[PDB]
Design a protein around this ligand. Sequence first.
Ligand SMILES: Nc1ncnc2c1ncn2[C@@H]1O[C@H](COP(=O)(O)OP(=O)(O)O)[C@@H](O)[C@H]1O
Ligand SMILES: Nc1ncnc2c1ncn2[C@@H]1O[C@H](COP(=O)(O)OP(=O)(O)O)[C@@H](O)[C@H]1O
Ligand SMILES: Nc1ncnc2c1ncn2[C@@H]1O[C@H](COP(=O)(O)OP(=O)(O)O)[C@@H](O)[C@H]1O
Lengths: 186, 531, 522
Amino acid sequence: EKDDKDAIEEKFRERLKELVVPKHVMDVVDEELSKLGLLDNHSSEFNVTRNYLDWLTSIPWGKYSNENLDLARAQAVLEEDHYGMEDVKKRILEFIAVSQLRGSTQGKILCFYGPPGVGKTSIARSIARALNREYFRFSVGGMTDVAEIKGHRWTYVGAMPGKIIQCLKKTKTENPLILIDEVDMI
Amino acid sequence: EKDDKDAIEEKFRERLKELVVPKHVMDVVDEELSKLGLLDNHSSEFNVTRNYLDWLTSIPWGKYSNENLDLARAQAVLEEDHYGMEDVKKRILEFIAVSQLRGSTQGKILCFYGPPGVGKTSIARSIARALNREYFRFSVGGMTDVAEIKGHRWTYVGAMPGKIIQCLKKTKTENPLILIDEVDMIGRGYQGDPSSALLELLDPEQNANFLDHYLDVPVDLSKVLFICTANVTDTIPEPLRDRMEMINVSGYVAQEKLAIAERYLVPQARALCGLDESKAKLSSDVLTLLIKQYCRESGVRNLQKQVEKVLRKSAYKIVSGEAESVEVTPENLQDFVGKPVFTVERMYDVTPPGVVMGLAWTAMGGSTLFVETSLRRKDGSLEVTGQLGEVMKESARIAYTFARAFLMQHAPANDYLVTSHIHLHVPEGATPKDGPSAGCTIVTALLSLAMGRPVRQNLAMTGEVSLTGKILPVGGIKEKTIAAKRAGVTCIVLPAENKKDFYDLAAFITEGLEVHFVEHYREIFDIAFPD
Amino acid sequence: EKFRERLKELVVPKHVMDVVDEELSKLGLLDNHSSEFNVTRNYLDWLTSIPWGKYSNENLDLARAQAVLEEDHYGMEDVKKRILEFIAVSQLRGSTQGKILCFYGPPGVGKTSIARSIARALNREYFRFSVGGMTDVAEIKGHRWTYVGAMPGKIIQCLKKTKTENPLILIDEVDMIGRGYQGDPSSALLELLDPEQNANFLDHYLDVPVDLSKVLFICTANVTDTIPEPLRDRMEMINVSGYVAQEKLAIAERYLVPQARALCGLDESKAKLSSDVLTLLIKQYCRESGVRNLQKQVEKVLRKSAYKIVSGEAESVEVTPENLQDFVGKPVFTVERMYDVTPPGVVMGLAWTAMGGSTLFVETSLRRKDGSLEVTGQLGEVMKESARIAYTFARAFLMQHAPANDYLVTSHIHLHVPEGATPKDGPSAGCTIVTALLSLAMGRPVRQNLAMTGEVSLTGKILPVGGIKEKTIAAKRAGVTCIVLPAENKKDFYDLAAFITEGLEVHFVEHYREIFDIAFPD
Ligand SMILES: Nc1ncnc2c1ncn2[C@@H]1O[C@H](COP(=O)(O)OP(=O)(O)O)[C@@H](O)[C@H]1O
Ligand SMILES: Nc1ncnc2c1ncn2[C@@H]1O[C@H](COP(=O)(O)OP(=O)(O)O)[C@@H](O)[C@H]1O
Ligand SMILES: Nc1ncnc2c1ncn2[C@@H]1O[C@H](COP(=O)(O)OP(=O)(O)O)[C@@H](O)[C@H]1O
C-alpha cells in the first residue's frame, strides 16, 4: 500500500510544500488523502480520487510572479514593438505606474475594441514582455457553453474541467495576463 | 520484481536515447520511471504509466525525414504525377525555395479550395512523396468530438491522446504532411468546439507549443505542413479563414479532362483491374463522347466512374472469352455503359421572350441557370421564386426598380412593368454571397418581357447592378466562364472591374468566346437588344 | 499452450505478435489470484480467436458461379452482371478483391436474399449486420475495455465467429441511419467505406490494427437521397427493380410456392397450388412492387394446408379460385384505381416512393380583385414554390389558349397532392398540377386512364424525373392505358424490358403545350 497509495500522496505533498496554500484547501486535499488510502486500488473511483488530488496540488497557490517595474524600459519595449497606439501605450504605462506607487501588484480589466487585423492581439504580447507576466489566450467567439470555464463536476466520467485552471496549471503562477477575445460574438 | 522492472524500464530507455529529446520530457519520464520502480506490477497505474511511456517514446523528437532541395526534381515529380494546377505547382515550388534559404525544415498552413473531384486530395498525396515527407490523411468533416484532436485526460485509465499524436507514432517524423478535409463542413456539438482545437494548429504561435490532454507535454508542430480542403470559401469559420492562405484549385474544360483521362484515368483504371494495354484500348473520340454526353461534373470523379465501368465490362469479356479482344469504339460503347444520358446541355435551344441565360457559381461549381418571367392579366407587382434569401429579395426589388427606371428613360410610351403583375423564377444552387450575381440578369428579363423582343441567341451575362444601373464586380469568374463554355455559349458580358480575372485564364479556355466588358447597364442594353 | 494452439496454426502478423507476447508475458508475471489476470486472459483469447492468415479459398471458377446466381433468383440481370464483373476482375488481380456494393430499392424485392446468393457463389462467409436507426458508435468501434460490461464491436465479433479475413458483410438500411447524443455514427461508417482505414482498423477493446480490406461490403437502401453525402460519393450504386403481375407470377411459382412448401416440409402433391389462384392473389391481395404481401399470403394458405393434412378433414389439399376463401377469406383490395371515372378538376399523377412504385391522384376545388391557391398536404418548401410556378404557368397558359375565360385568374382554388414522394421526387407532380387547374377551368375532365408526370418551368418547358423504372411498374399495376413522359426521359423508357412496356401508349414531350393537346381531345 506504501508502494502505490503513499507514493501518490508524497509526490503531491512535497510539490505543494513551496506553495502558500490557504487553510480551506489543505482540509479538502487531506480528506482526499485519507480517501486514497481508504479506497481500493483498482476501482474507477480510485482513478477519479487520484485525478482530483493531482489537479489540486498542480495548481499554484500564493506563487506571485515577479516584475522589474522599471518604467523607462517598459515604455521603450512598447515603442520598439509597435508604431501608433499611443493611447493604449499611455493607459498601460499608467497601470504599471499605479501598481508601482501602491508598492504592490494590481489586477484590473481592460479592453481594446478595434477593426480586424489592427494589432490588438500583438499588443497583448507586447504587454506581457513589458510586464514580465505570463501570457495566455482564450476565445469565446461562437461559444455557448458555461462548462468550459465553470468546469464539469468531478463526479462525472469524461468530465472536462475549467479552462482557467488549465492556464493556471500551464503558468504555474499567479499574476497572469489573459487575453479574452471575440467577447461581442458570445 | 526489481530485476524484471529494470528490463521493462530499459526497453523505453533504448527507444528515447536515439531521439533528440527536449529537457522537460526527460524530467517527465524520470518521474514516471521513479513511480514504476516503486509501483507493484499488478497496479492499474503501473500499466497506464508504462502505456504513457510508449506514447512519449513514439514521438519523433528531432526526427526529420530529410527534405531534399531540387527545384527540377520537385517539378518533375509533380509534372508526371498531375496535370496542370499552375497556381498550385508554383506555390509548391515557392515552398521549396523558401525552405532552401533556411537550410532547415519548414512548416505552413494552406487550403486547397475548389469544386469536388478536381484532384485536391490527389495533389496533396503527391506533395508528401515529392518533398520526401510521410503522407497522412485526417478528417474533421462534421465531427463534433474535440477529444479527437486534443485527446482525453491522462488520468482516466485506457484513455488515448489525439489522433495527430497517433499520426506521429506511425509516421515517426516531426516533419509530416497532414491533410485535413472538408473544414468548410465543420460540425457543431455540445461536447466542445473542434474549430478552436484546429485554431490551436492554424495559429503559428500556438502551433509551436501544442498541448494534449493525455500527453501533458508541449510538442512542436511549426515544421508540419497542414493542408486544408474545401468546396466553398464562406462557410469556413473566420479565425481559421484568416490564419491561413487560400489557393483556388480549378475545374477542367473538355481538353484538360481529355488529357487527364488519357494520361491518368485510363492507366489508373487499368491498374485497378490488372488489365494490359494490349487487352483494353479506348480512343480519344470515345472519351470525347464519354465526356460530352455522359458527364456533367466540373471535376472528373463522375467521368472516372464512367471510365471505370467501361473497363469492368471489358475485364469480364476477356476471362470468359465472349468476344474478340476489346477495342472500344463509339459504335459499340453502348454495350458498356448504355445510352446517352444528356442529349442537350441547356434548358432551351433558343430563349423565348423574357428568358435570360445567366451564370452562377454554385457550391458544387460552375453551371448555367436560365431566368424566366411571366404575366398575369393602381400599381404593378413582382413575385419571385426559389429559396431566395432576404438579401437577394432586396436585390431583386432593386433590380425590379432599376428595370422600371430604365424603361421610362428609354421608351416612355410603353407602360409594361409599371401597370402589370409580373412573376419571375430564379433557380437555386447559388451561394449566399453569389446570390446578387444575377441581378442585372433579372433586369434583362423584365425588359425582354416588356418589348417582347427576345434576348439575342446564346448570349450570357452576369453581374450585380446598383439602383441607378451601375454594375458591380462579381466573384469566381473562373468558375462561371468554365460553365458558359460547357453549355455552348458564344458571347458573354461581364463587369469592367472583372477584367483582371478573365485574362488570368488559359488560352484554350477563353478562346471561341467573344467577351464584352461593361460598367453600367445602358451598355448592356445595346448588346442584348440591337434593333 | 492453449493460446499457442491458435497462434501456431493461424499465421500472425508482426505488430499483433508483439501485443500478444507482451500480454502473454504480463499474464505470466500477474498473479492468477487477481481479477486483472482474467482481463488479460479474456483479452488474449479475443486476439487468438481472431483469424490471421486464413483467407477463404476464393473459387473464381466463373462458369459454376454463373449457374449459382441464375438458379437462385429470377431476373436481376443487372445485379448479376455487376457480380460477374467482380470475379473476372478478381481473376486479373489473381487474388481476393474488396469492394462496396449498394442495393437500393423497394422493400421485399430481394436485396437481402440476393446477398445470400453472392455469398454462396463466392463461397464467402455471410455475416448479417444492421445499422437501421443506430445512434451509437460503440457498435462498430467497440466500448473501451476499462468500462464495466465492455464488449468489442460486432465487426470484430464477426471475424472471431467466421474464422476468416475474407467475409461478406451485409449492412442493411444505411439510408436512414440514426443520430444521437454520442455523435454521428456515419463517421465510423466512413472508416469502413474507405480502404485506406480498412487496412489499419482498430477497436477500443481490441487495441490492435487489423486488415479488413479485400472484403465485399454489401449495403441496402430504400431511397438514394437520404443516404449521407460523404457515404454517397464514396458509394457505388446498383438499382434493383420492381415487378409486374406476370413477373410476380413466375416468382411465386418457381420460388415462393416451393419455398413455403419447403419451410412447411409439405409435399407438392399434398398441397397443390395453381397459377390462376396466384393471378387473383396478386390482383386482389397486393398493390405494391414488393412480394412481402404475396409471400405472407402463400404462407397463410400453406400454413392452413398443414393443419388440413395433419388433422385429416382434408388430407388432400387442392386449391382452385373458388376455394381460395377457405385459406385467405374474401379479396382485401377489391379495386385498383380509386377513381374509375375522373370528374373535372381531377387528374392521375405518378410518384417514386420509399415503399416503391406508387400511384396517386391530384384534385383541385373551388372556394367561392385577385385569385388565390391553397396548396395542401405535408408538402415541403420546394413543392410549394413549384406549385406557385405551376399555378403561374396555369395562369399564363390559359390567356394564350382561350383569353375570354377568367376562371382561375379571378376565383379561389384549393389543391391537394398526396404525400409519400421523396423531396427529390416532390416536384415531379408539377406537370399534373397544371393539368388539374386547366381541367378545372373548362370543367372538361382528362381522357380516361391517363397517367402523367414531369417538372414544368415557369414558361412551360418540362424537365426529366428520376426512377421512371418504378413509376412505370406502378402505372401498369394500376392499369393505365396511356403514359406521357418527358422527351429527355426517353432514355429510361427504352432501357426497360419489353414485357413491362407492352400495351402502354407512351407520348414524349418537351413543352407542356404538347401535354395539353394530348390530355384534352380538341
Ligand atoms: N502598431 C503596430 N505597429 C506594427 N505592426 C502592427 C501594429 N499593430 C498591428 N500590427 C501588425 O498586426 C499584425 C497582428 O494583428 P492582430 O493583433 O492579430 O490583429 P487583431 O488586432 O485583429 O487581433 C502583426 O502582423 C503586426 O505586425
Ligand atoms: N490534374 C490532374 N492530374 C491528375 N489526376 C487528376 C487531375 N485532376 C483530377 N485528377 C483525378 O481525378 C480524381 C479526383 O479525385 P479526388 O482528388 O479524390 O477528389 P477531390 O478533389 O474532390 O478530393 C483523382 O482520382 C485524380 O487522379
Ligand atoms: N426476383 C426474385 N427471384 C427469386 N426470389 C425472389 C425474387 N424477389 C424476391 N424473392 C424472394 O423474396 C424473399 C425475401 O426477399 P428479401 O430479400 O427479404 O427482400 P428485401 O431485401 O427487398 O426486403 C426471398 O426468400 C426470395 O425467394
